[PDB]
Design a protein around this ligand. Sequence first.
Ligand SMILES: NC(=O)c1ccc[n+]([C@@H]2O[C@H](COP(=O)([O-])OP(=O)(O)OC[C@H]3O[C@@H](n4cnc5c(N)ncnc54)[C@H](OP(=O)(O)O)[C@@H]3O)[C@@H](O)[C@H]2O)c1
Length: 253
Amino acid sequence: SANLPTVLVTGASGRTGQIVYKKLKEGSDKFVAKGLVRSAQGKEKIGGEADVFIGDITDADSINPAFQGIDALVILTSAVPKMKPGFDPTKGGRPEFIFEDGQYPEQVDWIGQKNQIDAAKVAGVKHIVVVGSMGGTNPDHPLNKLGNGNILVWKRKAEQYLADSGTPYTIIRAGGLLDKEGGVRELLVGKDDELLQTDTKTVPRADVAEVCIQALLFEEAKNKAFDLGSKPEGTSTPTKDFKALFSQVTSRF
Ligand SMILES: NC(=O)c1ccc[n+]([C@@H]2O[C@H](COP(=O)([O-])OP(=O)(O)OC[C@H]3O[C@@H](n4cnc5c(N)ncnc54)[C@H](OP(=O)(O)O)[C@@H]3O)[C@@H](O)[C@H]2O)c1
């Protein structure tokens, strides 16, 4: 094992996950990519290569092969609520959202992530990175009501479990995600939702992807939990010194 580390990214066909997968592939001088997706559909979306496996994190037997012989894991899975199909705007309600049964945050963001961290640990992973969301400091956050899922709460439960696990970890609580260009913004690190009080509380999905990659390359990123926002493009100088960036972070949770 002068060999480069094998990095498995889960949720690899999701919007952020697909970018991590791409960056892991391009980074063939530093990493060996692997990916886990929920469907043959998702597999083809990211290129159908043989380093992509299909499995469901709520059924732990199915994800086992993906987890074999990995040195690092980037968890990019999430419960995803859908619009309840009954909606009729023209007498003032607001849309209700739901999660399919067995697809609620408790099952996917807590249990699902527990499944992944547990199998990673069985496999002897060296570093687990997880992406979640800002808001977690406030259990009354409106997002928790989405589909009655308590999504932030269950996610933070998995983050806590990860932090308590004994495996070196990086927890990245993203601000509101943007479908905009990465690598073109100064990136900001925060603690305990402080950025929610600022105007720099959103972040390109590409920059979240890049922070995940850099986490893998600096000891400084290990046993760290932090929030991730950004300043807008064209305003200031895009982050390049990640050692500095991660040395700003002291929080373990
Ligand atoms: N949206 C925001 O503004 C916001 C803000 C802050 C943080 N975040 C968090 O940021 C992270 C990335 O967000 P994103 O929008 O880029 O993610 P995303 O597009 O929703 O991708 C989530 C992935 O999870 C996968 N997944 C769901 N259930 C699964 C299961 N049972 N087994 C295996 N995979 C499963 C989905 O697979 P499929 O492709 O098959 O559906 C999907 O690829 C998420 O944790 C999200 O909660 C989001």
